[PDB]
């Protein structure tokens, strides 16, 4: 099952190239400009085998809750759309979503006590480091 030292309040600490993220994403240029300065807090929790993860920030706060391996529905907090799955493989929690025949892919894996989030779009990736509060 998914480590519970995932779970907890995770503060955002390092973040390069959210911005061509967002661009790759298709996200307009009033919502790069507010994610780019949003610097949110993510909060894990679990629920018996269901887990939930909230993204805090000044901007948007937006929550999902999943059990691992079965497809679930989510509004971004860019409005997509998307069929979204989450999974474990070798310990790393790994989300993929899909819209109109596009994917993306946020993979968080723990890394001497923080949590790394890679997020790929096309080509471009993004790395969020958080730690543990």
């Known amino acids: 099952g998914m480590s519970n030292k995932f779970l907890g309040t995770w503060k955002l600490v390092s973040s390069e190239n959210f911005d061509d993220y967002m661009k790759a994403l298709g996200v307009g240029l009033a919502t790069r400009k507010l994610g780019n300065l949003a610097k949110g807090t993510v909060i894990i929790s679990k629920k018996g085998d269901i ?11 937006t929550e999902i809750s999943f059990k691992l391996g079965q497809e679930f529905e989510e509004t971004t907090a860019d409005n997509r759309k998307t069929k ?29 006590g923080k949590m790394v989030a890679e997020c790929k779009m096309k080509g471009v990736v993004c790395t969020r480091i958080y730690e543990k509060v």
Do not use: A
């Open 51 to 61: 887990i939930t993860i909230r993204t805090e920030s000044t901007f948007k706060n």
């Open 84 to 112: 979204s799955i989450v999974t474990l493989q070798r310990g790393s929690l790994n989300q993929v979503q899909r819209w109109d025949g596009k994917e993306t892919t946020i993979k968080r894996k723990l890394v001497n």
